[PDB]
Amino acid sequence: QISVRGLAGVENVTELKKNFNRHLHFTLVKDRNVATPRDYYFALAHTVRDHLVGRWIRTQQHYYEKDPKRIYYLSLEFYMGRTLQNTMVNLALENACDEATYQLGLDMEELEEIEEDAGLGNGGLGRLAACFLDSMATLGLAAYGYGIRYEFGIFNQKICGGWQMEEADDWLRYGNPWEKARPEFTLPVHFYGRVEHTSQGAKWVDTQVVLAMPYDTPVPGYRNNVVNTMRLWSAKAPNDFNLGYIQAVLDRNLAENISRVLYPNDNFFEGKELRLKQEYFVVAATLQDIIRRFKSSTNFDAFPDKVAIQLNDTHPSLAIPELMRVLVDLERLDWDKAWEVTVKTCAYTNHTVLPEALERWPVHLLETLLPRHLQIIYEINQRFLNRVAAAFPGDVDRLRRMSLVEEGAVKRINMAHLCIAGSHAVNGVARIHSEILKKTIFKDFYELEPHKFQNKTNGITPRRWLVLCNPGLAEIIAERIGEEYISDLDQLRKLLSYVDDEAFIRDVAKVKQENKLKFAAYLEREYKVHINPNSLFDVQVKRIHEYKRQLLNCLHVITLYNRIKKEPNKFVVPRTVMIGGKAAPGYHMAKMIIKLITAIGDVVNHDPVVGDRLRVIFLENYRVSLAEKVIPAADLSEQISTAGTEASGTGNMKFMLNGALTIGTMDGANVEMAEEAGEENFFIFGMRVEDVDRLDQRGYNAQEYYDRIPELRQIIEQLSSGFFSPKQPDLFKDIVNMLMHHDRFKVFADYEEYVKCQERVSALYKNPREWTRMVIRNIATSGKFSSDRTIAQYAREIWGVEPSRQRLPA
Amino acid sequence: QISVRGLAGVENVTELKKNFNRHLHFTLVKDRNVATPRDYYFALAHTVRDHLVGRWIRTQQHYYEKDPKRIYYLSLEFYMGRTLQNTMVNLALENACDEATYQLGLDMEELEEIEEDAGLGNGGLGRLAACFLDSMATLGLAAYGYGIRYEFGIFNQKICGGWQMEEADDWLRYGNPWEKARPEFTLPVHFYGRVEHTSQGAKWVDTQVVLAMPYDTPVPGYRNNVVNTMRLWSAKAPNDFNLGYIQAVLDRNLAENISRVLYPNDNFFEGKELRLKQEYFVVAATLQDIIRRFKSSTNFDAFPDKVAIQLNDTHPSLAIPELMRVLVDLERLDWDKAWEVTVKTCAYTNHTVLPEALERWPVHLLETLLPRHLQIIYEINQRFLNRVAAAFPGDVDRLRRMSLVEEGAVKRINMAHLCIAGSHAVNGVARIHSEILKKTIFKDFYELEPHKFQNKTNGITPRRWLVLCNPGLAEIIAERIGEEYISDLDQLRKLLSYVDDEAFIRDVAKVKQENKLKFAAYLEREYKVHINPNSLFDVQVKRIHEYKRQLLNCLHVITLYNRIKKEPNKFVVPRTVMIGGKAAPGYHMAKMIIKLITAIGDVVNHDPVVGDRLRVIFLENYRVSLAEKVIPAADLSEQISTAGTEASGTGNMKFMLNGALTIGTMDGANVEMAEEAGEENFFIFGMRVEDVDRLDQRGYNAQEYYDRIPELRQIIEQLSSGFFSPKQPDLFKDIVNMLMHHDRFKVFADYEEYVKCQERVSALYKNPREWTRMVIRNIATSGKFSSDRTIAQYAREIWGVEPSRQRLPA
Ligand SMILES: OC[C@H]1O[C@@H](c2cc(O)c(Br)cc2O)[C@H](O)[C@@H](O)[C@@H]1O
Ligand SMILES: OC[C@H]1O[C@@H](c2cc(O)c(Br)cc2O)[C@H](O)[C@@H](O)[C@@H]1O
């Protein structure tokens, strides 16, 4: 149907049809009479998978023969979403498969909806790893993603009586056609035990053993015939485990619990032993695999020339002492040489400055679980602090500030400090964030080793986040400037020459309208909710957090409602306000915010005076597959975190690429987005980082705003009195108390500017032609935010490898 | 190479080769450079599996269109062993696959050794179910095996310091290519809760739910193109299970523990709640599946005309009250009609008369776990006892004896009584056993309902137990009488006309020698143990139990050793005595017997005076795949249970078919074996059932035998004094004490006759020609013991269906 989806050749369609029938028969053991829609999905999945394997085998063979430097991306999260459409896109198979299935009497889009999301992540950090894998394969890097194969990913969110309910994401129930178990590469991982000192070094003895079994998933590059590997470890008990008899067999579950479930926290540290076990499990198994592959290419001087290890946040920080352990205890290298190898191999990416998100593990935990690693950490710390003392003689407070060991009630290890000490490069994820790191939390470290500190502004893959989710937009762009932009997003700048092109303006606006109609229909079909498709689609989708300020959005919604009720017969630009995202199960305030949103919708959506002018909808179960649907449909992107809190954001980039305008603070990557598009083409409001700092020195008094803003006063009175909860008048007491007395994120301080800025959004939307022209100026300047750009920067500036767009033989 | 293994046609070999390469590439994602022997096994397994699927789909389609009466074989055990060779045999693919793999540079026998046993059974009862499935498919019956998919089968046995050690049988670690998951046929199973009485009957409410997910395995008939199904249920937690968050997800293991592990008890009842859950789990899921299939053919009058349910022992006895529950509570049938349907549908097979093996469930357990079923059992009991009272007025003791409820310290339900009451047919498994049932333990029931009681003498499948494991013998037989005997074993009688044929005598003896050489080499290669291949191979392989009297064998071995030591320079027929089998982990005496056997070997095997004249070997990890190796190699089969204790035995039949002579008591099927072959061709010794009864009335005094048999006295003195355990003199004190004071199985009583009989075995073995002629007379009369004969009898006399040898279209 559309060009960017590839060719549907006679030969290819015929072959896809026969291979589909073969899999339905031999693989699924079904015929057309007893086959379910799910059977048809799997038949297609296996058919597409067949096309990967040849390229997958020859890619890995190519790496063995050429022996390039290998990149190992270690992450506790890989938020992959669905694989079927992505594989078709990257292999240029989409139109051919669409044709083949149509001829078999099936709708491919219907079949695509059957696939479960691989929800092995919480949000931005996990999705970044997924975009990164796509870009590394597209740029022909010898890259491996290493993580954990969680049996249960991020919970499925149900809304019951306006409250979030959690249920287990049993994503593997029907099987996973994409993975390949590799039980032959199973490796042992050690826990507990004790340290013995001998005449020939230290020995870690009397350990408990858990086996790590790898499952490999292909990661195809964009039409370059490269297929890289994501390797995910699964926990297995050894067969002599606890070996009355029956209980011993049943107790195998304890060991295998390591890979059972993803911790559902985003931007929050929970210091649980199971999480620590998960973190060591991935690191220990991965490092053995790395070293094995390095030897099968004795002399570890060349190790950093052939190996780069990227630490995604501090979660895999134990890689540093684990590498030291293997090099010193097992390979018999001297400390200084082992340390040189470690530092040159490891690099660390920081993703947050929020104090509650920073990993600080109690010493007593590491003492029991990993006795040898604690000893190595202490030694690293002593040697590091000796360097600090020599550099800054007499500065005793610096020594306490920089220490890997934090003293207090319970002694803790600061994993961020460990990462900086043992890495040759430390980067933040957006220019403002990387600057904040050098100025505030890592200031002492920057002063000691300035060369270590870098910036790598985040990006998103234009394959999933344009071609896959918005083929209509991808097509109208390709019609003008060709297809090369898909792996060279900077080419979108060529669209600036079409800003006054009447045909293009109309086409851009048409694609958005179509996307909105499709999403409005999805809401009626799957959720029985009614919306006006001619209204402005105002959307905020991201994890529920106080710092992300879903509460500020709520205040604006109530302001709009109150203004309508005051002057009912006055015209207002109709809006559909959509908010979605999951709350961490133990985060009370976040769960209260979800309830507030639904409670507002309950009042607003059923007021006859409002009509179709204002609708408030909570988007249930926000996840990658839902993002792919709602983002192309959005008119307005809400990126309203308190300045200095959102390290980068990536949702922001997705909305920009897909034809929404942005209302936002100067926070994270918003700053660079506004810089690229021009501030005139961005709806910027609120305090800058400097303004927050000034308010903090003075002391933030929320009462001042309440006293001086009558519209804000009314809302707080409405909340307190039970306007949005008539049967439970005091339901939102915690929210009011927080807002009034202990708001870390200064919601009231940005309220006036936000509401004013929103009025300017409504004004522009009244002029469709000028709205669309501003949209074109955003899409045209979104190029910098391709993860291809990001990965090329990591490659050249951290890993010391050159990216390549050259095809491998088909 | 050999005829019975089928044709190796040019076309077939070429196709097998290309499909093997396809699976290695697309299925296993490997090339010939990085492929392991296990990869080659799986490539072959998938290739052979492809040939099943077409026949499997069309068999089940045929059953849907013809709508025959369906047979449901319910068992907690299916001891299947390996599947690869069996599938090749039944599909006539063995020679073709051998040729294809040879041309690819691979040895097929080497690849066959890689497959894990499906060890989902303990011994005879589980293996009988496996032989039965093979025969039902071969006889073209619409039959389904229903059981549990245990994650862990019977433990792997390790011998350490002469002691049994258990380790988990993680048989699914590398995957199972034979099974197909059917998550679309997942069914709920209910536990606990309470019973509410309404105006419209009783209701079972507030239950806990476990899901039952079926996995289907094909069961091919012998070259008739029939492929039946074995359906095994796996336990799954519902997704809202216990839905802080993390613990709730981890607790899903509790529900899924139902299908985790097979209870490793053979002929012993362990009254554990987990076992009861297993028993209900299989019954509840199966019955829903049966009823669903019956409706998809309202009027349950026709239910018994379309459904037969066979209960393999009392383990699935809950089928009776569960069927009643569904019919009364859910389908709204009146009690009397539901009972009529139940009785006509269900039939029960008893497998033991040992009191410790009989299932008697505490009422308090059933009260808590299955409250509605207990109520139904009480009602069944009241109505049944009213019938007894009307038939035998005033016989109050009969009423207490026949009751389903046993009074005492803890009230118990006798599941055997439940089965008789609710079944239209009750059978024992050998003529002597079925007679014992009518005369002793079920005498009261036989008197009430004589028509209910039948015999069905056990059998073994000649496919696995001759063609597969002994192709050399199968071939020399086929050379004379053709191939038809493989599915018509009675044809072996034609071999009687060759008893004086010099060519045949030589060929029979040659096949045995070859088998012995091959096994003697297997012992050196895999276990580094040395044996003389010219010695008499004296073997006892079966589970370790006091009733099976491995101890009597031990006494004979020591007698032989002592006689050699007394007269070293006297000639004796050299023997290799092999004993193997697993002991239940909690069965202390059985574990002591294993230690005794190894301890004897430790002394005997290292005595220079003995030389190669006597060797004692414990066969480690006895299982189906090992039986297939050792049984063809045996000269002498030990079947020496105390008369009246071995219900049938099936190992006995396997040895008879494979050219071993039998030394045995007149117990179980031994009686019928001797009847078929002629008593002159069998080494019969010891007490008959009547003799045991006489001794029991008098009182068994072991001291009498000790006092009057000096050779026996010496052995007991040797055991007590520490002759076989110098470092631990009192090690075997428990064994001596048992033998002397509390031997339920009268080991001493049969000692003299046994030793005398063994002397006659050695005498015959000295005359190879006459030994072989007697062997021919055994093989020639083994026909009755085909499970094809057994299943044809069940079909005609219990199920009311006619077997068929007619082929389905290929
Ligand atoms: O860098 C990727 C994303 O990481 C997010 C992020 C940072 C963390 O430290 C953790 Br733990 C989870 C997470 O999603 C940031 O909040 C975003 O600002 C950023 O865009
Ligand atoms: O009928 C099959 C076999 O069942 C065996 C047998 C009977 C049982 O009740 C249990 Br529980 C387990 C078992 O293996 C008998 O001991 C054999 O004599 C018989 O041949």
Curated annotation (Swiss-Prot), chains A, B:
Cofactor: pyridoxal 5'-phosphate
Residues bearing PTM N6-(pyridoxal phosphate)lysine: 654
Annotated site residues (Involved in the association of subunits) in this chain: 97, 131
Changes after translation: Phosphorylation of Ser-3 converts phosphorylase B (unphosphorylated) to phosphorylase A.
Activity regulation summary: Allosterically regulated through the non-covalent binding of metabolites, being activated by AMP and inhibited by ATP, ADP, and glucose-6-phosphate. The activity is also controlled by post-translational modifications including phosphorylation.
Pfam families on file: Phosphorylase
Reactions mediated catalytically: [(1->4)-alpha-D-glucosyl](n) + phosphate = [(1->4)-alpha-D-glucosyl](n-1) + alpha-D-glucose 1-phosphate
Annotated Gene3D superfamilies: Glycogen Phosphorylase B
Site (Can be labeled by an AMP analog): 144
PROSITE patterns assigned to the protein according to its UniProt record, in alphabetical order: PHOSPHORYLASE
A molecular function GO annotation: pyridoxal phosphate binding
Modified sites of kind Phosphotyrosine: 192, 215, 446
Modified residue annotations for Phosphoserine: 3, 403, 487, 720-721
Cellular component, GO, one term: skeletal muscle myofibril
Enzyme class at the top of the EC tree: transferase
InterPro entries in UniProt: Glycg_phsphrylas, Glyco_trans_35, Pyridoxal_P_attach_site
GO biological process: glycogen catabolic process
EC number(s) from the headed UniProt entry: 2.4.1.1
Keyword Cell membrane: no
Keywords per UniProt: Acetylation, Allosteric enzyme, Carbohydrate metabolism, Glycogen metabolism, Glycosyltransferase, Nucleotide-binding, Phosphoprotein, Pyridoxal phosphate, Transferase
Residues holding AMP: 31, 64, 292-297
CDD domains in the record: GT35_Glycogen_Phosphorylase (cd04300)
Task of the protein: Allosteric enzyme that catalyzes the rate-limiting step in glycogen catabolism, the phosphorolytic cleavage of glycogen to produce glucose-1-phosphate, and plays a central role in maintaining cellular and organismal glucose homeostasis.
Subunit annotation: Homodimer. Homotetramer; to form the enzymatically active phosphorylase A.
Entry's family note: Belongs to the glycogen phosphorylase family.
Name this polypeptide is given: Glycogen phosphorylase, muscle form
Source organism per UniProt: Oryctolagus cuniculus (Rabbit)
The organism's taxonomic lineage, starting at the top: Eukaryota, Metazoa, Chordata, Craniata, Vertebrata
